[PDB]
Design a protein. Structure first.
Length: 426
């Protein structure tokens, strides 16, 4: 009962295509990960199982590394965590890279696990390594991860016979880097990384016809536009606010390919993204490196301090459509929400609305969540008609990008019903 199938593309390798016409919002695939792990920055912040930020987490007794929101989450996570727990324990104080911890879970899943439904269309052994396209610097980085893995796993795995029969650690890491999915929360922090081999069949487009959304570790693949029978299915591997030059570099470095898509050919939106004095937004772009690092580690007061020094800077300022200014406004909004400043969060969030409409496609999950947060801030500050307009716009987007299978849609429906009741009382 699949609406999608694997096929061999001409120049792109393997891909995924529709066997039947698809309509916007239609659910193509849903899977749990083959393996996944919390990211280094969100470790000890978000529950290891459900990846939700909780006010109270508790450490696993043995390793004291994994943290859980509930006994339910540690029990559900115990099969995945059982063997790595002894590895994390023995390697303290040192914490392995995310890719190393992710591959360790892959190895344990393949060794001790039943066949994973995540592999239905495509398996881990099928994944693209792009090894013959790797530069010598990339290969050396992989060699370092191999030795890190051999150190990190030395407790559980001392020899190749404990690895799967065909398993080559160099090839395995090459596969992990190109096939890893980043799991993000509503604040654009990356809370986790996981492998979904069936979903790895989707080739990239900067103008994709599909989108992925995450509910905890659970992934949902949906069509965001009408798709003809036989048409290849694509997602965007990258953040939507990047210049064609930035996208080219990232797609080269990580995925070893050159994007020929129409947006990259025409440098679509590049000029509008870079508006303002070039010297000014180079300095903002440099500051974003530190700001987004603080955000990855969930230090909001420090994020807001740096963001205000930009938005409010005595020195020259940039238009809100400048993508680096826009990223700063977004980080400030998310800091104000966590720090409990709603008026200021709404001020920043309101300023991101029109730029988000321009830069994000018609239905994109990032924009849907952004509009939902703004409408939610407006509702709680008691602007009902403004909140209702944005909550309805968020629903128009998120019914396509998220769908009834996503828990956030249920929350949005409750916000709409509350906002509507307030308007009718007036
Ligand atoms: C988490 N997710 C993002 C993983 C993607 C794994 N693959 C896709 C499936 C591949 N075709 C396969 O056979 O397994 C990427 C790889 O696919 C190629 N690829 C893609 N999109 C191109 C595109 N638009 N143009 C050219 N090559 C593309 C590229 O080599 C690139 O590393
Ligand atoms: Mg190849
Ligand atoms: Mg946001
Ligand atoms: Zn949990
Ligand atoms: Zn443990
Ligand atoms: Zn492109």
């Amino acid at each position: 009962p699949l609406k999608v199938e694997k096929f061999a593309t001409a120049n792109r390798g393997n891909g995924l295509r529709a066997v039947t016409p698809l309509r916007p919002g239609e659910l193509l695939f849903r899977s749990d990960p083959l393996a996944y792990t919390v990211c280094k920055g969100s470790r000890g912040v978000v529950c290891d199982r459900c990846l939700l930020g909780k006010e109270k987490l508790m450490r696993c007794s043995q390793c004291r590394v994994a943290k859980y929101c509930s006994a339910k989450c540690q029990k559900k996570a115990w099969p995945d965590h059982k063997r790595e727990c002894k590895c994390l324990k023995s390697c303290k104080p040192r914490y392995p890279p995310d890719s190393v911890r992710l591959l360790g879970r892959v190895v344990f899943k393949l060794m001790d696990g039943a066949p994973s439904e995540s592999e239905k269309l495509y398996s881990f052994y099928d994944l693209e390594s792009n090894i013959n396209k790797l530069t010598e610097d990339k290969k050396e980085g992989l060699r370092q991860l191999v030795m890190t893995f051999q150190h990190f796993m030395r407790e559980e795995i001392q020899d190749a016979s404990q690895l799967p029969p065909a398993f080559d650690l160099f090839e395995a890491f090459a596969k992990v880097i190109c096939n890893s999915f980043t799991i993000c929360n509503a604040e654009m922090q990356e809370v986790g990384v996981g492998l979904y081999p069936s979903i790895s069949l989707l080739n990239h487009s900067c103008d994709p016809n599909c989108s992925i959304v995450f509910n905890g570790p659970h992934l949902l693949l949906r069509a965001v536009r009408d798709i003809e029978v036989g048409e290849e299915l694509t997602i965007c591997y990258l953040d939507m606010l990047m210049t064609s030059e930035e996208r080219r570099k990232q797609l080269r470095d990580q995925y070893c390919f050159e994007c020929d898509c129409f947006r990259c050919q025409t440098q679509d939106k590049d000029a509008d993204m870079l508006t303002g004095d070039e010297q000014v937004w180079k300095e903002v772009q440099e500051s974003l490196k530190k700001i987004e690092e603080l955000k990855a580690h969930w230090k909001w007061e420090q994020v807001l301090a740096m963001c205000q020094a930009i938005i409010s800077s005595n020195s020259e300022r940039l238009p809100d459509i400048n993508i680096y200014q826009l990223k700063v406004l977004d980080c400030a909004m998310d800091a104000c929400i966590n720090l409990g400043l709603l008026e200021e969060a709404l001020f920043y969030g309101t300023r991101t609305m029109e730029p988000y409409r321009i830069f994000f496609p018609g239905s994109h999950p990032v924009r849907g969540v952004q509009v939902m947060k703004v409408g939610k801030l407006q509702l709680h500050q008691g602007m009902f008609p403004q909140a209702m307009k944005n909550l309805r716009l968020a629903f128009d987007i998120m019914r396509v990008t998220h769908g009834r299978e996503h828990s956030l849609i249920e929350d949005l429906i409750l916000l709409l019903e509350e906002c509507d009741a307030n308007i009718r009382a007036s």
